[PDB]
Design a protein around this nucleic acid. Structure first.
Ligand SMILES: [Mg+2]
Ligand SMILES: [Mg+2]
Ligand SMILES: [Mg+2]
Ligand SMILES: [Mg+2]
Ligand SMILES: [Mg+2]
Ligand SMILES: [Mg+2]
Ligand SMILES: [Mg+2]
Ligand SMILES: [Mg+2]
Ligand SMILES: [Mg+2]
Ligand SMILES: [Mg+2]
Ligand SMILES: [Mg+2]
Ligand SMILES: [Mg+2]
Ligand SMILES: [Mg+2]
Ligand SMILES: [Mg+2]
Ligand SMILES: [Mg+2]
Ligand SMILES: [Mg+2]
Ligand SMILES: [Mg+2]
Ligand SMILES: [Mg+2]
Ligand SMILES: [Mg+2]
Ligand SMILES: [Mg+2]
Ligand SMILES: [Mg+2]
Ligand SMILES: [Mg+2]
Ligand SMILES: [Mg+2]
Ligand SMILES: [Mg+2]
Ligand SMILES: [Mg+2]
Ligand SMILES: [Mg+2]
Ligand SMILES: [Mg+2]
Ligand SMILES: [Mg+2]
Ligand SMILES: [Mg+2]
Ligand SMILES: [Mg+2]
Ligand SMILES: [Mg+2]
Ligand SMILES: [Mg+2]
Ligand SMILES: [Mg+2]
Ligand SMILES: [Mg+2]
Ligand SMILES: [Mg+2]
Ligand SMILES: [Mg+2]
Length: 86
RNA sequence: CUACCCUUGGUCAGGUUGAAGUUCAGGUAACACUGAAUGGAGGACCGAACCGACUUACGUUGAAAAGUGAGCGGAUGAACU
RNA sequence: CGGGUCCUAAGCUGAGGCCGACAGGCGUAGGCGAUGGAUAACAGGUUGAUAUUCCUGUACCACCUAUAAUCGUUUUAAUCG
RNA sequence: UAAGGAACUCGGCAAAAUGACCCCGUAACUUCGGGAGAAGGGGUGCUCUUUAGGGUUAACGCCCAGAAGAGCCGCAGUGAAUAGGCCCAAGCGACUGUUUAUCAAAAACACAGGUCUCUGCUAAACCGUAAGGUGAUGUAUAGGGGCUGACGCCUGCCCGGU
RNA sequence: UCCUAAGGUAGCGAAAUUCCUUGUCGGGUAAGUUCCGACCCGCACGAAAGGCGUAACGAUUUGGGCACUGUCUCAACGAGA
RNA sequence: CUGCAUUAGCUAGUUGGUAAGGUAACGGCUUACCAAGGCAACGAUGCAUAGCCGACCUGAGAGGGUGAUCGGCCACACUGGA
RNA sequence: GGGCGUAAAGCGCGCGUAGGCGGUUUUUUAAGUCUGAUGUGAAAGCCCACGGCUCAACCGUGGAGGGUCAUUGGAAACUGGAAAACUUGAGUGCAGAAGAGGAAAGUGGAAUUCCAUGUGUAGCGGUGAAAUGCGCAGAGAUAUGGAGGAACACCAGUGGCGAAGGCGACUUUCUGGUCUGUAACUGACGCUGAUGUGCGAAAGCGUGGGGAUCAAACAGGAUUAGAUACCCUGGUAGUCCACGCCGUAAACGAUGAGUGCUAAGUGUUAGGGGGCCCCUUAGUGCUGCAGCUAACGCAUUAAGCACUCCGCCUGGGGAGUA
RNA sequence: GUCGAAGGUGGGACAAAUGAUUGGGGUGAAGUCGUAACAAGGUAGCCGUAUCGGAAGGUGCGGCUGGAUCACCUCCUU
RNA sequence: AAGGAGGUAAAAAUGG
């Protein structure tokens, strides 16, 4: 995604101002990246190399989600319902 | 009459099976995928009408110059008329 | 009511036309041609023998004649087409 | 139709047997559709009691349709009639179709698929003396002819002869 | 080594093809010129006049079972023309 | 307290509840009803093998092998049921 | 109380589930962990002692032993559980770097083959030497034009990129990863990874295209004792494209991943900081201590020293067979 | 009358033995044919794959060095 | 000057 869209997403999902490393911010940006790569792959089906990075992003988001669900169930539920990633 | 064809019409009780597609649920990063429901395909299934003619008995100066009785095959199809 | 005084399909025929020893064959316009399209009447009664045909009752279609509420009266504007 | 039960016969030809509905259950193999109604079993009448339902109706009523239990009768309850016999193997043809009207229905024809070959359009092929037509109101993913004949795995060598 | 254009590959094989022949061996039967499996001295298979397989299908040809029975042992009685 | 996954699914009185019956006794032990539960990769199920132990043999030990005689516990008495 | 570079042994490589394991501090719990008491672990046996058979075996009597045992009381360092903090690991933000990383379209030059035509004559081609073959119907050579397929000369480098396989003309679009500095940001969120799920050179399979070159099969010639070859002349599949399938290679560094620690010298790729020099990060090479090794050799890109997890081995055949 | 051993009937599952015939494997004596590998083994070998051939093997494509080697350039180490 | 890595020519009868 563009740095502008990334800035918009981090502004939207940041827990507080100046927050860029929160699980919410990271997983929202990862959701955007995953969707963009999925849209790319839909046209360029045979781009296995890109799809591999996509899967790395998916696993990173999964681990962030596991950590967030372990730390704060309510935050996890709110975030997943906000992002539509369940 | 009969073969093929042309144009235009008609007919095929009843029962059965349950293709594709779709929806819902689950599932996936997304797809595959799984289940249920829905759906109603087929020179598909059983079986009358209808078409046919495998076996057999009878008939053989016949009821009939090719039939009759009992079984037999197809029966939405390259169907029958 | 079914057919004709309506329509066309396959097919048949075919002015001129094209072709061919003769005979004649082919074919355009045009015709003919239902198995299809269009198309106004029903119930009851009655005879030995016909009946949506005769009779009774009640309809409908096309056309004609007279009288007409109303509208028109020559670029028309009523009306036909 | 006693006893027997294919000993008949070219051959189980004919006959006999099976046959309906419900429930249980069902193999190899398979192109995953099937094979399958595989096979192999169980139930089936009538009376009464209790009782979940569905359609139509204000309701009553009418119609459809189960479950459980307890009883009754016969040799026998789809009490008649109508209604698959089944299985294990092998050859052939893939299959549904078609055929010698009137001794042959098949392993024959056809077939979807394969391949070869001709054909550039007034196409090739075909009918006709021709005109005129079919091909086609089509145009090489098309049209004619030959051979092969679903599908799977394959299809070797020889161009001297014709 | 002779000859040829070149000498039959895979698969299959006493076969819808095998004369000899009821080949031989194994299975099935009390007994099997048929049948099934195998062998290969293929008289005289063989790759689109296709080779070899093949689920499903068949009034197809073939061998074996269960059931069944007047087909038979071996005939008898009854009804009707 | 045992081997195998070239055994991955098993279970329908099965798992729980209610009532009754039954037993010295509790209990699905059995029956009737309701529910769909129960077990399993921490190895269920299936298959194979086996009486278990105190002990015995061996080994420096850790371990490995064995389960005669003697003692304990179990199971059986031609086979199966009562 | 062993191993896996070359002896048998690292899955071809990712992504990732269960499980195993897990950074620093504080408080708390007592499951593991440690310690005391009680009961029990029959008898016989083994071991130690004593006594009786004349000895011994043997017999007898005491002692000792044997539990991963149970109940109960105590400790809190470590592992486990609960609560609270940290930024060093791991990600994120911010500023920068290079790249044959991948996918899809388009453009281009050289060269090969073929077709047409002009000139031209008797060879061409090929080999160790030859012949098959092509060519007097005009070959080969030469000039021009056309058809079409395939690969990208120089750059090019122990160079770059990618998990591996792999990626080299140029242009555009889409897209993955990596590295450097910074210290806002989260606050252990990590490592490994059975089962699973994907990618995976070449050959090969299916359908449809395409077809220059090269070339299994195959034909001819040569060599040879023979020559089902090596060599020569042809030549089909295939080699190319799309979409599916296959899932294997000496898929190799014959070297699993992560992490830290342990002398040095010298290149090179992409960066950064301080004065051509010094320092520094990440790679990529060479040389070489300690240490390791059967040896060869490895040696901050370990095959050294250690911890975690996975895979794998246990003489050669039989056999990667049934 | 319920339960009920044995028995009967049926289609399946599993195990063992056996079977005309058939397939490779191992061992064995101076057997027959060739000579693939080890040196550059006289065509470097080997790996995966495809196909062909009496046989070892040959050939094609990609891969490896666990390959010898005369001349050349390109770098790195002492 | 001596060693390590990459590319790359030319040659070739047959049997010991
Ligand atoms: Mg039918
Ligand atoms: Mg007929
Ligand atoms: Mg009849
Ligand atoms: Mg039928
Ligand atoms: Mg029928
Ligand atoms: Mg005239
Ligand atoms: Mg009419
Ligand atoms: Mg009359
Ligand atoms: Mg009798
Ligand atoms: Mg009798
Ligand atoms: Mg007989
Ligand atoms: Mg007889
Ligand atoms: Mg009969
Ligand atoms: Mg047929
Ligand atoms: Mg006839
Ligand atoms: Mg007949
Ligand atoms: Mg034929
Ligand atoms: Mg042929
Ligand atoms: Mg015979
Ligand atoms: Mg023949
Ligand atoms: Mg032929
Ligand atoms: Mg045929
Ligand atoms: Mg038929
Ligand atoms: Mg025993
Ligand atoms: Mg020892
Ligand atoms: Mg090794
Ligand atoms: Mg490896
Ligand atoms: Mg004791
Ligand atoms: Mg390939
Ligand atoms: Mg060649
Ligand atoms: Mg391997
Ligand atoms: Mg390896
Ligand atoms: Mg370095
Ligand atoms: Mg040799
Ligand atoms: Mg060699
Ligand atoms: Mg060859």
């Amino acid at each position: 995604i563009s740095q502008e869209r990334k800035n918009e997403i981090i502004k939207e999902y940041r827990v507080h101002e100046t927050d860029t490393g929160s699980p919410e911010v990271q997983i929202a940006v990862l959701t955007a990246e995953i969707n963009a790569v999925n849209e790319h792959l839909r046209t360029h089906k045979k781009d296995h190399h890109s799809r591999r990075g996509l899967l790395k992003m998916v696993g990173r988001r999964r681990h962030l989600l596991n950590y967030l669900r372990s730390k704060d169930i309510q935050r996890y539920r709110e975030l997943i319902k906000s992002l539509g990633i369940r």
